[PDB]
Amino acid sequence: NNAIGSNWKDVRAELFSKEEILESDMRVAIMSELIEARNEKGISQKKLEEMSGVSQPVIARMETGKTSPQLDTVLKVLASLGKTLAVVPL
Amino acid sequence: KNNAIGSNWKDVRAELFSKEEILESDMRVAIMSELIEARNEKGISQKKLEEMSGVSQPVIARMETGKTSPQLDTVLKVLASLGKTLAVVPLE
Amino acid sequence: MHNIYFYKDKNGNEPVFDYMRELTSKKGKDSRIKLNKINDYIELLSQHGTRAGEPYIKHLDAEIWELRPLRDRILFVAWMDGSFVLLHHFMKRTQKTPKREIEQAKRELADLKERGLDN
Amino acid sequence: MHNIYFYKDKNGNEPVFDYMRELTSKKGKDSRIKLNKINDYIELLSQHGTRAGEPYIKHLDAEIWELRPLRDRILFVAWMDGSFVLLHHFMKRTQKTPKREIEQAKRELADLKER
DSSP states (O other), rough: OOEEEEEEHHHHHHHSOOHHHHHHHHHHHHHHHHHHHHHHSOOOOHHHHHHOOOOOOHHHHHHHHOOOHHHHHHHHHHHHHHHHEEEEEE | OOEEEEEEEEHHHHHHHHHHHHHHHHHHHHHOOOOOOHHHTTTOHHHHHHHHHHOHHHHHHHHSSTTTTBBBHHHHHHHTTTTEEEEEEEEE | OOOOOEEOOOOOOHHHHHHHHHHTTSSSHHHHHHHHHHHHHHHHHHHHGGGOTTTTEEEEEEEEEOOTTTTTTEEEEEEEEOOOOEEEEEEEEEEHHHHHHHHHHHHHHHHHHHHHHOO | OOOOEEOOTSSSSSSHHHHHHHHOOOOOHHHHHHHHHHHHHHHHHHHHHGGGGGGTTEEETTTTTEESTTTEEEEEEEOTTOOOOEEEEOOSSSOOOOHHHHHHHHHHHHHHHHH
8 A cells, every 4th residue: 555654663763863762752651651540540630649749730741741741740650650760771 | 786876777767758758869869879970980070971961061960969850851861871761660 | 552654645745754854854942842742642652542542632533533742733543453544734723623634634544545445 | 788877875865866857847848858868868878888979978087977968967987897877967057067076976986986
């Protein structure tokens, strides 16, 4: 099929450096935890606000935000989900 | 043995701080450690890390002194220059 | 894990890729920001499919779905699984996605099925 | 890697721990800030020992070192390789570290070897 073109895996490798891909996956991993907490564990975003003690707008900006999210904020949210971050070799 | 030698810090730390505070403390020292183990060992100065990571000097400075928590992107950049990065792992 | 394919028109150009390559050719911080967000949402679609839910993904009409990084909108469809096909892209000008974009998406989908038959 | 113990005087009190505990008791959120900085620095001493370098630690006189979490100062010594012992606390109101403090640490340290 001539209408079915480039695979995203090849496109991503062209448009982004290895560092940009590394940062993206990490942002995706955090998003993935918010998603499958809602999908499986049945936790709402405001339910998460009470467990993690971080405000709902700051949680939402992890997903939709232009920029950050801050490190301590990520650690609070992940911890309430039974997860955390660790320094690991590259 | 010795009465002058008192409580172990591991115990004192566990009593005075929540599980949450300790984990965030462990992350701050882990980041501080990398910057330190870069400086007196690998001979990488803050000037040198600035141009390696593309992250500026005031930003890396505050990243070391934990007053305000860093953005994830900057942390991953600085760590990458040093041969490390973050992974999502189970709590324990 | 789901495969993600870019739609190629008759010329052939891949509109979504062409747009991303345009953002890559631009200075200024806004384009870099938009690029990173687009990178995250597509990769997210690759891992979770439509199970990603809102804010990342919303259904529009029939087979047509939309990916919503920031103000950017990428229309896509379910394809022979495990895949998805990214159709084309537009900037949000309105309260909601307009009819015009949806119908262009459907034509592109129809085009895909026809050109897929000729083998 | 390096263990840290708290000095316990004749009365059975540990001065540094006593100070941190009252910080824990206070409502003020700067008490929390000082506590967190102390948490980081002591933990840092645990991993890197005296190799941590300034601003975190500083050599004062002879066997005495100080930890410098903001304006809090915690005097400590090498001990029992490879560990350390936190002697006592003072807030620094000057840019000089008084030898009043240092000789107290020396006398504290003296008490350690004795017992």
